[PDB]
Design a protein around this ligand. Sequence first.
Ligand SMILES: [Mg+2]
Ligand SMILES: [Mg+2]
Length: 294
Amino acid sequence: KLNPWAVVGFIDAEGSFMVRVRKNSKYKTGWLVVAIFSVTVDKKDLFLLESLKTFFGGLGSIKKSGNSTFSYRIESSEQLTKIILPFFDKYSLITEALGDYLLFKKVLELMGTKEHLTQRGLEKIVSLKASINKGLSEELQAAFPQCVPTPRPEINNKNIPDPFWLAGFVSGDGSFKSILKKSESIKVGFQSILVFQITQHARDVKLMESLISYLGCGFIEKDSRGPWLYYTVTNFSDIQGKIIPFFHQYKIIGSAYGDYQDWCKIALIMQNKNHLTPEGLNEIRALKGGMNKG
DNA sequence: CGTACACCTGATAATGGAGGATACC
DNA sequence: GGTATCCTCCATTATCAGGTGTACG
Ligand SMILES: [Mg+2]
Ligand SMILES: [Mg+2]
């Protein structure tokens, strides 16, 4: 029982829009063109993959991916055009994932009129694929030297469309951190810190910036090493006053919801000042130990 | 004593594929 | 045949995530 804007928020965090162009001499052009919508998570979130499937009309399938991950995927061109496109055309992505989605859609529209089974459409598809995710492989790059990449979508400053979007997004790219930090001055030897965090690539700077006014707190840290921003809340009265109540009403999805509850329990012990006693520190240690376990 | 932001860093849950088998027309 | 989808498998990595230092009241 997922809400539409939560699903969009989650796919803004974790979805993959893929176009594969595979060599095969049984096709008249020599290539097979396939579009895939894919969501891949640890098995701990297998129940959220099942909800997603049910949400998307029972379509697609859920399969072992890696050692301990499972993917939900839709690989039918037809089913993609019928269910996925009208969903995201109505409830639009707001990160740079939107750019990949829009180029993915164009490929699908070209597959819909069968233009992919022609030389000219295949070339267009290769140009579209060229600006999606990591771009052309060495194989396609060499087989398609003429194909100029299609300009990436310039979509400007997108607002958070609905608070449920933020719930979904934080479900994928948010962290509810409990830290126990050695302290020379705290009477129990340790500081208990709750940190709320959202991690994104720097190109979505405007979005990340808008979280501060949206949530009425936080600040953006930039990783000194690369293009990575961490929207961060460390002020405990903001945690209590703004973050916890937001997510109480707009609930996180997946097993991360259990983690948020645990984190909430730490805050309670902290609101009571019991984190500054050995017993309270130990409760927090137990809650924390329990986090991220399914 | 205690909090809060400034600053640091790495293991791995996702990123984003791959190719062979089977079904459809 | 030609075309479409299903299924199984995975190499590498961009983050999440798990910190520590220190100024300030
Ligand atoms: Mg993400
Ligand atoms: Mg994520």
